[PDB]
RNA sequence: AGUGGAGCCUGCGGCUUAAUUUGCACCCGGCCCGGACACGGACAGGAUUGACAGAUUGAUAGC
RNA sequence: UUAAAUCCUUUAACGAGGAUCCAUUGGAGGGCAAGUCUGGUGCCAAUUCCAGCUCCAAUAGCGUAUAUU
């Protein structure tokens, strides 16, 4: 309702120095650089665990033994039933490597060796980007979580020269639908192998949150001492570098393919592969040590009368 | 089907707007 | 004597509780 | 929380489907909402929108053009 | 051999029926509709109407654990792993671990060369509980997945087999069951599994006939609580064959007479929006008189929703068979 | 949706040509990236 | 002058009912029929049509 | 061609019908260009979220953030 002229309306009565900034920026820069230097010094140095690298060839045309021959300082070649994963020491470059390799399609091999790896090196062929098996492995590896990765190609120099440049051109485009801003290193010769090793040692590391909150381990050696051989159940001695966090014996130890287990002792023998060339650490107190308690520990009518008229 | 692109699409648009 | 709405008063909510982890 | 200065902000995601590409502790590239520094005329008190998660755009993720790693 | 093809075609037709008509169930012409649907109820509004989370829990919930406050407990554990300093083998140290009771087979596994890794669990991470864990669908695989078939779960360094429950990923208090894994959007899989603190990645695999594991989904562990209820929905459809002004006679939704009395208080809805109530049974054949808020069309289909809380099945198997190397079909 | 309805009723009162009010009056066409 | 009180009848509601039709329409039982197209089955070794008698049925009836 | 090449330019041979040898990026049903449209999904016919059709604009280019005019 809008009042008109006969209603009383009264109009309202209106009524740091340059040097101090420079010094402060220098202080903050010194803080950031010392934090970064400590974190980059931890991985792959003398006071830290080896740089563990997973080599995955993403095509069937890629000759993996050629590439792992190019990648191998001194080479201490640990060797298994079919796989050859070796330690590399480069004291000139002051850095320690453990190279494993795995073929795509073998799911648990690549998924375990990619959930302990610091670097993943994907091998490529010059003509096609990847295979169908490589694409499946890429989907699984992206889904699980990628660490730092580098893309290396193997057959560019084998092609005739007049196509090589534009071959690489197409290759980059073929890569860019999944790896958008990534440099395609060429791995053909020993000099390029050294360049790749240098690029792998100095590169910023992607930190995966799950494995960084948890103490994990990759077995370099394993031995079995059975209590009774016919019982097929005995003590297991697993030897490797602690990677994720400080390791406490009072905690349950989950082996990935075989469930959680109770661990009883941690010994610290000599480091078999130091960068520059029997004491038991902690035994389990049978009181604060956690137990495997997954499930709750507490266990007048006539004969013909119908139902209506009744 | 496929659409014409470039000069042909503008020709189509011109014939559609003024010719018919 | 029952229907789909009254029989809901029959069901109890105090037997199979999971064991609670406290803060 | 912004990388270069540690400042906390609140950023906008285009819809509900794009929110599942975004996870805790992931690195995200953020732009302004769009009116040169003003907030939203429909939504109170938000000024920034998410443009990339894990170095891939939300538009490529939503349209299925690219996958993101974890 | 060919019976697998028969079951495959049956699953394809059932998936197409589900994506066409969501949860429509034909009323059993033989068994009474208050016997098949005895453990069902009707909700006025699916979102706002209440439901007791502790009501009528199964025997399996007697076996699992639950967090009073999961967020604060997780914050406490993450704080005491990032801040404190426990006396143990430090990072980078080459140790040997004496672990108590391990089968011999693991050792022989190392002897062909398979990687053998281990990790240390946080507190409460061995106990079983309910994992609510969000997954989409990988577009390489288009074969159907029903709700409670076995699947292989890769969840945060752990690998196991279970029968999930597929639920809608929404913001409401209770979440509707999805009878299939729909291949366009993000769903939730509910599993009996050991506790894991998020983040963790999810990789859903389906074991194939030739030994390969086909990848069907990808995602993250969202929460650890058995208080998330999955709500199975059953849609019963009748036909309004006699139409009056704001009143109709509906048949074929029920067949016994006291079935209409049993499901009387549940409200009704039509495919063109009209709501209403059952007034009274007509008799002996399940015909009913229903009062609606408007006039009806001759092609209308009256329908009714019944809701029952479902829980997953305890098929937690910590053993996953090794694949054969995957190749494209 | 009511905001667009108010603005269209404003433009109706002001005496200019206004689009017919339909089911698609205030309707988000697509997400904006 | 009454009606509202009482008895009886009637109208809407409501209650009982298989139905107590409604703003012979209702109920309980029994008949009769009810695409082609595509593809896969059976078919002259036989597809299929007709039928007296007796019976079920509330009654009869090759429906 | 050039230091030697490459590219371009010149020239043999092959090289086009769905000439599949397949143009994108944005916006439109409140105003500058551009809608009387469809199907799912909830809330009490109105109405949050999702996928499309149709149209318009510039075009091997076209959106966005920020600064600035």
């Amino acid at each position: 309702h809008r009042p008109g002229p006969l209603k009383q309306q009264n109009k309202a009565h209106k009524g740091l120095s340059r040097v101090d900034q420079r010094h402060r920026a220098s202080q903050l820069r010194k803080q950031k650089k010392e934090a970064v230097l400590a974190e980059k010094r931890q991985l792959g140095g003398k006071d830290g665990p080896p740089h563990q690298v997973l080599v995955v060839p993403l095509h069937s045309r890629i000759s993996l033994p050629e590439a792992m021959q190019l990648l191998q300082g001194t080479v201490h070649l640990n060797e298994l039933g079919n796989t050859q994963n070796f330690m590399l020491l480069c004291p000139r470059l002051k850095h320690r490597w453990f190279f494993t390799s795995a073929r795509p399609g073998d799911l648990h091999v690549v998924l375990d060796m990619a959930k302990v790896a610091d670097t993943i090196l994907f091998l490529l062929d010059p003509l096609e980007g990847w295979d169908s098996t490589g694409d499946y492995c890429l989907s699984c590896l992206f889904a699980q979580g990628l660490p730092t990765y580098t893309l290396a190609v193997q057959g560019i120099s084998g092609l005739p020269l007049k196509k090589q440049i534009d071959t690489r051109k197409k290759l980059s485009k073929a890569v860019e639908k999944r790896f958008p801003h990534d440099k395609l290193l060429l791995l053909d010769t020993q000099q390029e192998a050294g360049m790749l090793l240098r690029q792998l040692a100095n590169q910023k590391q992607q930190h995966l949150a799950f494995r960084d909150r948890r103490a994990y381990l990759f077995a370099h050696a394993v031995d079995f001492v059975p209590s009774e051989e016919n019982n097929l159940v005995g003590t297991l001695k697993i030897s490797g570098y602690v990677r994720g966090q400080t390791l406490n014996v009072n905690r349950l130890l989950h082996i990935v393919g075989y469930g959680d287990f109770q661990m009883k002792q941690i010994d610290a023998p000599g480091d078999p592969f130091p960068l520059n060339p029997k004491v038991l650490m902690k035994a389990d107190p049978g009181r604060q040590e956690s137990l495997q308690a997954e499930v709750i520990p507490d266990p007048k009518v006539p004969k013909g009368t119908s139902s209506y008229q009744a | 089907k496929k659409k014409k692109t470039g000069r042909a699409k503008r020709r189509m648009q011109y014939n559609r707007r003024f010719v018919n | 004597k029952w229907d789909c709405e009254s029989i809901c008063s029959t069901y109890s909510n105090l037997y199979n509780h999971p064991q609670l982890i406290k803060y | 929380q912004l990388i270069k200065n540690g400042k906390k902000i609140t950023a906008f995601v285009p819809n509900d489907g794009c929110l599942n590409f975004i996870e805790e502790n992931d690195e995200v590239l953020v732009a302004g909402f769009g009116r040169k520094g003003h907030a939203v005329g429909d939504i109170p008190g938000v000024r920034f929108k998410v443009v990339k998660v894990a170095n891939v755009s939300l538009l490529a993720l939503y349209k299925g053009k690219k996958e993101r790693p974890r | 051999d060919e019976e697998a093809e028969a079951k495959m075609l049956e699953k394809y037709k059932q998936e197409r029926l589900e994506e066409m008509f969501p949860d429509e169930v034909d009323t059993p012409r033989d068994v009474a509709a208050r016997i098949r649907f005895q453990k069902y109820r009707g909700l006025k509004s699916f979102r706002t109407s209440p439901w007791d989370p502790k009501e009528n829990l199964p025997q399996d919930y007697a076996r699992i654990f639950q967090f009073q406050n999961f967020t604060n407990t997780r914050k406490s554990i993450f704080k005491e792993v990032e801040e404190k300093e426990v006396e143990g083998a430090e990072v980078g140290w080459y140790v040997t671990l004496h672990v108590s009771e391990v089968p011999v087979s693991v050792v022989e596994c190392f002897r062909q060369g398979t990687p053998l890794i281990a990790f240390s669990l946080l507190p409460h991470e061995q106990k079983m509980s309910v994992l609510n864990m969000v997954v989409r669908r990988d577009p390489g695989n288009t074969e159907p997945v029903k709700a409670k078939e076995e699947l292989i779960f890769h969840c945060g360094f752990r690998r196991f087999r279970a029968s999930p429950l597929f639920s809608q990923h929404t913001a409401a208090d209770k979440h509707k069951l999805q009878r299939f894994l729909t291949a366009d959007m993000a769903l939730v899989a509910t599993v009996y599994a050991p506790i894991t603190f998020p983040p963790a990645s999810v990789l859903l695999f389906k074991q194939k006939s030739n030994g390969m594991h086909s990848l069907i989904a990808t995602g993250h562990l969202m929460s650890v609580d058995p208080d998330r209820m999955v709500i199975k929905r059953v849609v019963l459809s009748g036909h309004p064959f006699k139409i009056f002004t704001k009143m109709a006679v509906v048949r074929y939704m029920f067949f016994n007479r006291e079935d209409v009395l049993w499901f009387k208080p549940v409200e009704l809805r039509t495919k063109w929006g009209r709501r209403g109530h059952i007034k009274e049974p007509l008799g002996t054949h399940g015909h009913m008189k229903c009062s609606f808020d408007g006039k009806l069309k001759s092609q209308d289909t009256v329908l009714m929703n019944l809701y029952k809380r479902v829980f997953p099945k305890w098929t937690y198997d910590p053993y996953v068979p090794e694949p054969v190397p995957w190749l494209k079909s | 949706r009511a905001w667009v309805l108010e603005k269209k009723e404003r433009h109706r009162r002001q005496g200019r040509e206004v689009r017919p009010d339909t089911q698609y009056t205030g309707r988000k066409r697509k997400p904006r990236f």
Side-chain angles (χ1 to χ4, degrees), chain A residues 1-19 21-299 301-310, chain B, chain C, chain D, chain E residues 1-82 84 86 88-321 323-329, chain F:
Chain A
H1 169 63
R2 171 191 63 80
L6 303 180
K7 195 67 150 76
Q8 169 95 73
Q9 319 189 52
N10 316 66
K11 180 151 195 31
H13 169 59
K14 303 293 184 70
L16 291 190
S17 47
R18 187 190 61 86
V19 59
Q21 301 165 24
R22 194 72 179 242
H23 168 245
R24 181 183 179 273
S26 175
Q27 275 174 309
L28 301 178
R29 186 167 79 236
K30 193 174 191 338
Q31 269 166 191
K32 285 182 71 111
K33 293 186 79 179
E34 65 88 21
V36 173
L37 171 60
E39 304 296 271
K40 291 194 91 82
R41 180 60 73 122
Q42 187 91 9
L43 171 73
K46 291 175 71 175
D47 57 292
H51 196 126
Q52 186 175 1
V53 179
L54 171 64
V55 194
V56 172
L58 296 181
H59 207 273
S60 289
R61 279 211 286 272
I62 296 165
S63 170
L64 192 55
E66 264 170 2
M68 321 275 308
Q69 204 45 55
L70 277 185
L71 296 190
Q72 76 182 4
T74 174
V75 176
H76 292 187
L77 188 153
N78 181 22
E79 199 275 335
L80 296 172
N82 49 8
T83 68
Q84 314 90 309
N85 314 337
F86 46 88
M87 201 85 57
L88 182 64
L89 305 168
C90 304
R92 202 210 160 170
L93 307 190
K94 268 212 175 65
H95 184 255
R96 176 164 64 163
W97 316 84
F98 188 55
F99 280 100
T100 72
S101 75
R103 190 156 323 267
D106 295 83
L107 277 178
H108 303 136
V109 180
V110 297
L111 287 196
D112 299 342
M113 271 177 178
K115 75 176 73 171
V116 291
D118 305 274
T119 308
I120 301 191
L121 179 66
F122 298 117
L123 296 179
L124 269 67
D125 49 317
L127 298 191
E128 272 96 10
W130 38 79
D131 217 349
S132 295
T133 318
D135 200 2
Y136 168 75
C137 171
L138 277 172
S139 308
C140 294
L141 279 195
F142 275 50
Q144 180 203 20
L146 286 176
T148 318
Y149 64 93
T150 314
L151 280 299
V153 184
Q154 206 187 50
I156 294 278
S157 181
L159 294 173
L161 300 182
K162 53 171 307 302
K163 208 162 311 302
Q164 287 178 1
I165 283 288
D166 48 300
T167 285
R168 189 176 186 157
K169 187 174 177 67
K170 290 164 190 294
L171 184 50
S172 298
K173 191 198 288 208
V175 165
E176 284 173 359
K177 299 315 167 148
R178 192 191 300 269
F179 302 118
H181 317 119
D182 288 329
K183 189 70 180 295
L184 291 157
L185 284 83
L186 304 195
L187 184 42
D188 306 333
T189 46
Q190 183 64 20
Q191 194 270 328
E192 294 166 4
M195 291 165 127
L196 169 83
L197 267 292
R198 175 181 159 246
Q199 178 62 47
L200 291 189
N202 306 295
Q203 198 187 18
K204 66 182 290 188
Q205 288 288 122
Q206 184 75 249
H207 280 292
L208 305 182
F210 185 83
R211 71 177 191 188
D212 275 339
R213 200 102 50 189
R214 298 164 166 74
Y216 63 99
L217 189 143
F218 180 93
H220 284 269
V222 67
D223 192 37
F224 193 44
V225 64
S227 61
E228 283 88 7
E229 169 59 39
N230 50 4
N231 204 2
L232 301 169
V233 170
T235 315
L236 185 61
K237 294 192 320 322
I238 186 168
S239 296
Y241 304 92
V242 186
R243 291 301 315 259
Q245 213 74 0
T246 181
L247 181 54
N248 183 15
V249 74
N250 285 276
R251 293 181 184 272
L252 284 203
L253 179 81
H254 178 99
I255 305 179
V256 166
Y258 301 96
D260 40 272
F261 289 112
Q262 242 148 295
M263 82 184 309
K264 33 123 95 55
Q265 220 270 310
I266 301 186
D267 47 344
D271 198 331
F273 314 107
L275 188 41
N276 273 107
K278 191 260 288 181
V279 33
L280 327 141
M281 204 252 131
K282 233 255 248 62
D284 97 278
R287 216 268 315 128
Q288 21 169 263
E289 190 231 33
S290 41
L291 87 132
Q292 288 169 80
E294 337 281 290
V295 191
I296 181 169
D298 175 85
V301 170
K303 183 141 167 298
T305 313
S306 68
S307 66
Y308 205 110
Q309 196 269 330
Chain B
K1 317 177 309 304
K2 66 184 283 186
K3 317 164 160 265
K4 311 270 202 75
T5 58
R7 183 204 55 244
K9 176 165 163 177
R10 292 292 190 183
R11 172 199 211 178
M12 185 180 288
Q13 177 172 336
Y14 163 71
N15 287 331
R16 188 171 71 250
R17 195 32 180 71
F18 291 160
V19 164
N20 62 7
Chain C
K1 185 252 281 183
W2 295 123
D3 62 358
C4 65
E5 213 70 12
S6 63
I7 195 172
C8 300
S9 311
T10 300
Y11 313 130
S12 49
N13 51 351
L14 61 84
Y15 263 50
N16 281 312
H17 284 204
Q19 184 178 2
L20 187 143
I21 299 303
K22 304 152 181 33
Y23 184 33
Chain D
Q1 179 175 37
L2 292 176
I3 287 298
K4 64 178 177 183
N5 46 37
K7 293 179 184 217
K8 323 290 195 69
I9 59 158
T10 286
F12 170 77
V13 193
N15 49 28
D16 300 327
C18 287
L19 199 76
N20 285 312
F21 300 109
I22 304 167
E23 178 80 337
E24 183 178 1
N25 291 318
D26 283 335
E27 60 276 62
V28 65
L29 176 78
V30 186
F33 198 88
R35 274 169 84 256
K36 279 80 69 178
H38 204 283
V40 181
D42 213 339
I43 318 296
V46 59
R47 310 139 290 161
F48 311 110
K49 68 181 175 193
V50 163
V51 175
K52 284 218 272 182
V53 185
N55 207 14
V56 297
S57 50
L58 293 202
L59 189 139
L61 285 171
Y62 193 79
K63 293 178 136 80
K65 294 166 183 286
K66 300 197 186 213
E67 282 156 330
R68 60 154 298 190
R70 290 191 100 256
Chain E
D1 181 89
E2 59 90 19
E3 77 277 358
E5 194 87 355
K7 298 297 299 304
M8 181 75 148
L9 273 194
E10 204 270 348
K11 272 187 99 145
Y12 263 81
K13 265 313 170 193
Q14 186 175 1
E15 211 188 20
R16 183 178 182 270
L17 196 146
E18 282 276 318
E19 62 86 20
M20 200 149 44
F21 311 107
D23 291 331
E24 286 198 17
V25 176
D26 271 19
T27 308
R29 304 211 150 121
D30 313 328
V31 176
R34 81 196 159 275
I35 293 293
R36 266 282 297 117
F37 310 126
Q38 169 186 16
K39 303 170 293 190
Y40 276 80
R41 76 191 66 178
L43 292 176
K44 305 142 201 63
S45 166
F46 180 69
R47 269 177 70 253
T48 63
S49 288
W51 200 305
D52 199 289
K54 320 250 184 195
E55 164 184 351
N56 203 3
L57 304 176
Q59 198 61 262
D60 288 320
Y61 277 3
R63 281 153 92 207
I64 73 179
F65 293 84
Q66 191 195 38
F67 292 100
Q68 175 183 24
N69 206 357
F70 175 71
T71 295
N72 295 56
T73 310
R74 195 190 59 177
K75 279 184 191 262
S76 175
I77 301 191
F78 283 177
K79 205 82 201 93
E80 66 183 1
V81 74
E82 296 284 279
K84 284 151 69 135
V86 65
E90 288 179 353
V91 181
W93 289 14
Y94 183 94
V95 301
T96 290
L97 306 179
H98 280 100
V99 55
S100 277
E101 289 185 355
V102 179
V104 72
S105 59
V106 183
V107 176
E108 278 101 10
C109 287
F110 196 103
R111 301 283 148 94
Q112 63 282 19
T114 76
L116 188 154
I117 75 167
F119 83 98
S120 175
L121 295 160
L122 276 71
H124 304 342
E125 277 215 354
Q126 81 268 44
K127 301 166 186 173
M128 303 268 301
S129 170
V130 166
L131 265 63
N132 291 318
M133 64 181 288
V134 179
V135 262
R136 227 143 191 158
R137 272 208 88 163
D138 160 73
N141 190 356
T142 46
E143 297 84 294
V145 171
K146 221 195 160 173
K148 295 185 61 41
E149 70 186 59
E150 68 93 30
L151 290 173
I152 300 138
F153 289 74
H154 296 219
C155 177
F157 276 44
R158 204 193 295 265
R159 197 165 66 242
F160 58 98
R161 275 191 306 174
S163 299
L165 271 193
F166 299 141
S167 314
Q168 276 189 346
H169 187 48
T170 55
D173 174 47
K174 58 187 95 68
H175 310 97
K176 196 183 87 72
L177 182 63
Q178 282 280 315
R179 288 169 191 258
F180 276 81
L181 196 64
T182 300
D184 58 344
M185 61 80 71
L187 297 159
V188 180
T190 305
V191 169
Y192 284 125
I195 300 173
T196 294
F197 292 98
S201 57
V202 180
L203 282 100
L204 286 208
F205 294 95
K206 192 203 51 153
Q207 188 158 358
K208 280 172 71 169
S209 50
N210 50 4
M212 298 173 197
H213 297 105
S214 167
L215 176 71
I216 97 191
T218 276
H220 55 106
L221 172 53
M222 157 187 71
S223 52
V224 182
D225 56 335
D227 280 329
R228 198 174 187 275
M229 41 195 58
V230 179
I231 298 305
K232 198 159 185 165
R233 156 165 157 257
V234 170
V235 170
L236 303 172
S237 65
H239 296 235
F241 87 106
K242 184 163 320 293
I243 297 169
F244 290 101
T245 59
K246 300 160 62 139
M247 185 180 288
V249 189
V250 181
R251 63 182 162 186
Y252 301 147
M253 200 208 277
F254 296 118
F255 302 122
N256 178 1
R257 190 184 157 278
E258 52 264 18
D259 275 344
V260 184
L261 296 184
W262 180 265
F263 292 116
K264 182 170 167 153
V266 181
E267 300 91 354
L268 282 71
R269 69 182 180 92
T270 65
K271 271 176 158 45
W272 291 270
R274 324 297 303 121
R275 325 171 281 180
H277 261 295
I278 276 167
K279 282 175 61 67
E280 57 172 355
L282 199 42
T284 300
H285 289 305
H287 287 208
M288 61 186 98
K289 314 185 173 188
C290 317
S291 73
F292 283 156
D293 44 10
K295 198 90 164 168
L296 283 72
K297 299 183 290 295
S298 66
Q299 72 270 19
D300 205 357
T301 302
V302 192
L303 72 165
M304 202 198 56
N305 294 347
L306 295 174
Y307 303 114
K308 161 194 161 204
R309 179 175 172 176
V310 298
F311 319 90
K313 193 196 166 189
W314 190 300
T315 58
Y316 163 68
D317 194 9
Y319 160 78
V320 183
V324 299
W326 190 91
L327 278 76
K328 190 55 160 22
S329 282
Chain F
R1 188 187 198 274
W3 187 87
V4 185
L5 299 166
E6 294 177 79
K7 295 304 170 188
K8 290 177 83 174
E9 187 65 29
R10 171 66 59 84
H11 280 234
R12 268 164 208 134
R13 292 182 224 122
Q14 291 176 351
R16 54 162 87 189
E17 181 255 320
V18 187
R19 287 176 182 280
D21 203 81
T22 60
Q23 186 184 4
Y24 316 107
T25 300
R27 199 163 177 251
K28 186 158 76 178
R29 294 260 195 169
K30 53 205 146 177
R32 316 283 190 188
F33 298 93

